C-alpha cells in the first residue's frame, strides 16, 4: 500500500518538475520569451 501511495506521489511530482525542460527552445520560461521576442519569433519557441 505504501508503494502504491509513493508511486502516485512521485508521478505527480515528476510531472511538476518536468516544467523546467527547454525541449530545444531558448528558454523554458514563457514570460521571458514573451518579454524578449515579438509574436513571430516567439511563436517558434512557444510551439517547441
Amino acid at each position: 500500500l505504501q508503494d502504491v501511495v509513493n508511486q502516485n506521489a512521485q508521478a505527480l511530482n515528476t510531472l511538476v518538475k518536468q516544467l523546467s525542460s527547454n525541449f530545444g527552445a531558448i528558454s523554458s520560461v514563457l514570460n521571458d520569451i514573451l518579454s524578449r521576442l515579438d509574436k513571430v519569433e516567439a511563436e517558434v519557441q512557444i510551439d517547441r
Binding site: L19, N31, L34, S35, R36, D38
Partner: protein, 289 residues
C-alpha cells in the same frame, strides 16, 4: 477556477538622464579596427527616437531580441564598441563570419546578444589626397577569440621565429586603409558601433522610456518589473536577496520572487487561477439548469 487581472503595475528604476547618444554616435575621433575601443553605459534612459532628427544608419541589426521590443525593456551590462572599417568589410561584423577583419581584428561570439549599427562617413574620414590614418592587421598566428583585442606591433615571420624587418620573409603585420573622396562605395569609410547587453537575469540601470506606476498587492494584476512582464498576485516576501540578485525561481523554473527596483523590497508572485470545479447535470433534454 479562472481569475482575470484588474490592474497594471510598472516598476522601473529611478532614472533621469538621457543616454549619451551624442558622445557615442557624434564623437569627433574614432579608433582603428585593430585597436577598437570599448565604453560602459549605465544610469540613463535609452530613448533612441531623439536620433530621428539628426542621424541615419545604413546597417542596423539585432540578435537575441526583437527590434520592436527595445522600448519596453531594461538592459543589464551595456557596452558600446566603436571602430572604423571599409565599406566591403561591414558584412564581416556578424556572428559566424570569416575574413581578415573577423579573423584577426574583431570577432563576435556565436551566442551574441546585442545590436550592430554602421553608417557611411566619406565626408569626414576621406580626403582628396587620401587618408591613411586607419589600419588593420592582416597577418597573425591563429585567429582571435570573441571580444579579444591585439594591439601588438611585432615583425611577423611565417616560420614563427623572431625576425628583423629588412630581412627576407619578414613583414610588418599592420596595413593601412586608403580612403579617397573619389573611391567607390566599397572602399569608402564606415563607422561601426556594436552594443552588447544582457536581459532579464540581473540588476539593470539602463531602461527605455516608460511611466512607472504605483504598487498593487493582494490582487490579480498585470506586472512589468524591469522589462519582465506577466500576470499574477504580488505579496510581501520573507526571502532575503543578495545585492547581486534581482529575480528568484522555483524548482519548475517559474519566476516566483522579485526585488522592487524603487523600494528594494522583496515580493512573492503567485498565479491567479486555482481550484477544481465540477458540473452536475440531469441531461440537456431534461433541463438546462
Amino acid at each position: 477556477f479562472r481569475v482575470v487581472p484588474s490592474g497594471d503595475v510598472v516598476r522601473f528604476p529611478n532614472i533621469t538622464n538621457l543616454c549619451p547618444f551624442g558622445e557615442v554616435f557624434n564623437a569627433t575621433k574614432f579608433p582603428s579596427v585593430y585597436a577598437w575601443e570599448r565604453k560602459r553605459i549605465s544610469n540613463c534612459v535609452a530613448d533612441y527616437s531623439v536620433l530621428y532628427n539628426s542621424t541615419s544608419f545604413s546597417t542596423f541589426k539585432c540578435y537575441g531580441v526583437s527590434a520592436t521590443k527595445l522600448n519596453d525593456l531594461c538592459f543589464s551590462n551595456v557596452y558600446a564598441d566603436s571602430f572604423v572599417v571599409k565599406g566591403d568589410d561591414v558584412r564581416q561584423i556578424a556572428p559566424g563570419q570569416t575574413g581578415v577583419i573577423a579573423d584577426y581584428n574583431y570577432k563576435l561570439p556565436d551566442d551574441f546578444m546585442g545590436c550592430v549599427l554602421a553608417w557611411n562617413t566619406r565626408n569626414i574620414d576621406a580626403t582628396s589626397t587620401g587618408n591613411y590614418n586607419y589600419k588593420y592587421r592582416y597577418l597573425r598566428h591563429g585567429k582571435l577569440r570573441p571580444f579579444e583585442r591585439d594591439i601588438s606591433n611585432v615583425p611577423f615571420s611565417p616560420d614563427g621565429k623572431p625576425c628583423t624587418p629588412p630581412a627576407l620573409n619578414c613583414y610588418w603585420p599592420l596595413k593601412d586603409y586608403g580612403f579617397y573622396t573619389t573611391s567607390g562605395i566599397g572602399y569608402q569609410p564606415y563607422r561601426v558601433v556594436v552594443l552588447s547587453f544582457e536581459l532579464l537575469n540581473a540588476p539593470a540601470t539602463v531602461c527605455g522610456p516608460k511611466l512607472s506606476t504605483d504598487l498593487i498587492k493582494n490582487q490579480c494584476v498585470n506586472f512589468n518589473f524591469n522589462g519582465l512582464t506577466g500576470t499574477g498576485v504580488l505579496t510581501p516576501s520573507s526571502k532575503r536577496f543578495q545585492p547581486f540578485q534581482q529575480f528568484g525561481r522555483d524548482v519548475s523554473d517559474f519566476t516566483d520572487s522579485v526585488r522592487d527596483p524603487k523600494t528594494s523590497e522583496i515580493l512573492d508572485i503567485s498565479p491567479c487561477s486555482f481550484g477544481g470545479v465540477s458540473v452536475i447535470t440531469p441531461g440537456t433534454n431534461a433541463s438546462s439548469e
